[PDB]
Design a protein around this ligand. Structure first.
Ligand SMILES: *[C@@H]1O[C@H](CO)[C@@H](O)[C@H](O)[C@H]1NC(C)=O
Lengths: 42, 50, 50
């Protein structure tokens, strides 16, 4: 089971992360059922 | 998810992924109707010692 | 002889739940290495049902 969580937040810090609290709301439970060990982003 | 209780309108708000709400003992305190997207409180109907 | 059905007779490790392995890797069933070429104690992982 490949579950996706997410949270969109308006930020205005130039370089690094802000400091605060924001919980992530699940979006998609994607039924792929495959071995995953090494991933690559775009 | 079967059960028994009094169904009343709910003042709570459910996020879109949320389908039902559990209390401390994990009994369904509030439910979302699968047909009409409206939230219902499940208060258990009155019990007492006679 | 309907040899259209096959099963993985030889594998090095036990599978995880809900796992599919279509890898065509040879197995080394002896001390003599196979190195991807069949020979002595080197047999195909999948064997056809007779
Ligand atoms: C059917 O159920 C969906 C919820 O999945 C709801 O949005 C829709 O209004 C319902 N339609 C009817 C005709 O009840």
């Amino acid at each position: 089971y490949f579950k996706i969580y997410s949270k969109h937040t308006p930020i205005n810090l130039v370089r690094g992360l802000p400091q605060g609290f924001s919980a992530l709301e699940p979006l998609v439970d994607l039924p792929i059922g495959i071995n995953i060990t090494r991933f690559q982003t775009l | 998810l079967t059960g028994t209780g009094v169904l009343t309108e709910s003042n709570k708000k459910f996020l879109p992924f949320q389908q039902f709400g559990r209390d401390i003992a994990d009994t369904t305190d509030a439910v979302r109707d699968p047909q009409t997207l409206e939230i219902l409180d499940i208060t258990p109907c009155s019990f007492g010692g006679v | 002889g309907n040899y259209n059905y096959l099963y993985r007779l030889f594998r090095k490790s036990n599978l995880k739940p809900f796992e599919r392995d279509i890898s065509t890797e040879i197995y080394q069933a002896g001390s003599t290495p196979c190195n991807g070429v069949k020979g002595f104690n080197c047999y195909f992982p999948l064997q056809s049902y007779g």
